Design a protein around this ligand. Structure first.
Ligand SMILES: *CC(=O)Nc1cccnc1Cl
Ligand SMILES: *CC(=O)Nc1cccnc1Cl
Lengths: 304, 304
């Protein structure tokens, strides 16, 4: 019993983290096979970030200008290219610790683990979600860029995020491992404001199911609702519209608890309208929206 | 910027987890050098747990009855002994992945990372605290026993917890790596109730400092207090008494923010008396007490 905000074990990713230095800029890279992936802004001074022309800045950079260090051993750079907002540094050594891996582009509401790194060294691991406004709420200091977000399916690491940017609102923006930003964000120090950070309704319901499974039941009520009625309330509270696809995804948790999805929607409706009244659910005073239905099933069944 | 509930990178501990089977009981063991550490109740049937005589149960067990599996390779058991509530299984192979390590016994209020395992395989990592009632609020299913809690100082893993027990209240009890339970708990299926789960005051104040550092300042007020006045309020709210030792520990965060510890105590006093009024601090609607002052400084300075 118990339900914690749980990251994937980080060992497979720890084995992939290198230090990348270009001039006075040091950040992190991801070493898979004989390629090191890092944010392209590794080539920028802070002054450059105001209005960088990356193709023009890149012309002044040679393979020997990209200093790549794995532990205390230097990697030889034999080639480099820009793909969207990442650099691919070809090195002469395949990472011997390369795990089975995929590059995946996640959707808003999907959770992932972040291995926060500085100078190619792991500092910690935490669980994030791709927010509906395509930001993430991370913990990232200067030097943390090139830290990656990932899921594990048994032995295969799916890399979904590389850290690039802090908005002035202190939220985070980054790319998939093809270097495409999530959302409308760009690797330039400009006016970029996040849109509405709406609540991931399907994730809250997953977490309410996790609460029932773990004995927290006080919020179960005598009511039901419909998708359309629930959605009128979701709108008002800046919750994502609940779709039949979400209802279908929640089916296994419905089955296990014997609580119809729409009944749990009616519980969530009362919690939105009435508040917690100073009570907690799974030790939280707000509705947690960074567990997916798949996260709940994983943690409640003990998948390794 | 940003402040997350952050675990240590788990790789060094992942490399230590084995499966231990005795009869029909499978749980996890920790393989360091040529010793595998596991809960002694590995020798019990569920029926035994009602009133186990461990010395008597152990007599019926030989080295060849302890099946120890690291990945898909079996380890040869060449000796076994009971130390308090753990078994030490001597194996003929030193774990080649043994990190630098210590066994440390932590105090209530100290945080640690848990690598939740099943069948010697990691499922996830999360951050816990030794509660003032010597429980922890974990996420542990059947099979999770022998999962360990740890801190890392650069390259040295300090093992502070091994998982043994779920109380009927769904909270967790376990031992240090010498097999001594935290608190008054025993490895028997009996009436054991947790005492008052008081809030770790020094940890809340640390986290309020983390909030200021990361831009959340709305709760800063015009007031101060004294340890004695604050403590009258702490008592009423089941918060741990704040000591001068705690004030001293918070000194660096005081220095960095320029907020006197006692001023931050007066902010915490108003928050206790007045509530959050539906506001959040670092995305939390309750006062977080599972960051130590050392955790805050670590995460805010990016230690690896
Ligand atoms: C994203 C990131 O870490 N960027 C950065 C900011 C300031 C200094 N160095 C770096 Cl890298
Ligand atoms: C502590 C733990 O994991 N114990 C347990 C309970 C039920 C079945 N197997 C085990 Cl091991």
């Amino acid at each position: 019993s118990g339900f914690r905000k749980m990251a994937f074990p980080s060992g497979k990713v720890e084995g992939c983290m290198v230090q990348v230095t270009c001039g006075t800029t040091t950040l992190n890279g991801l070493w898979l096979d004989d390629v090191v992936y890092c944010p392209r802004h590794v080539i920028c001074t802070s002054e450059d970030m105001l209005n960088p022309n990356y193709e023009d800045l890149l012309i002044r950079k040679s393979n020997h200008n990209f200093l790549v260090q794995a532990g205390n051993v230097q990697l030889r750079v034999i080639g480099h290219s820009m793909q969207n907002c990442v650099l691919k540094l070809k090195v002469d050594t395949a990472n011997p610790k390369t795990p089975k891996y995929k590059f995946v582009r996640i959707q808003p509401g999907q959770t992932f683990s972040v291995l926060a790194c500085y100078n190619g060294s792991p500092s910690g691991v935490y669980q994030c979600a791709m927010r509906p406004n395509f930001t993430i709420k991370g913990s990232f200091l200067n030097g943390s860029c090139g830290s990656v977000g990932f899921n594990i399916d048994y032995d295969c690491v799916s890399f979904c995020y590389m850290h690039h940017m802090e908005l002035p609102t202190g939220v985070h923006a980054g790319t998939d491992l093809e270097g495409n930003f999530y959302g409308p964000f760009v690797d330039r120090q400009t006016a970029q404001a996040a849109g509405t950070d709406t609540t991931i309704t399907v994730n809250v319901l997953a977490w309410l199911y996790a609460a029932v499974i773990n004995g927290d039941r006080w919020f179960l009520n005598r009511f039901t609702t419909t998708l359309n009625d629930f959605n009128l309330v979701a709108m008002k509270y800046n919750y994502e519209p609940l779709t039949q696809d979400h209802v279908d995804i929640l089916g296994p948790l419905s089955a296990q608890t014997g609580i119809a999805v729409l009944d749990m929607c009616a519980s969530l409706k009362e919690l939105l309208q009435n508040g917690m009244n100073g009570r907690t659910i799974l030790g939280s005073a707000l509705l947690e929206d960074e567990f997916t239905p798949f996260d709940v099933v994983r943690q409640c069944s003990g998948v390794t």
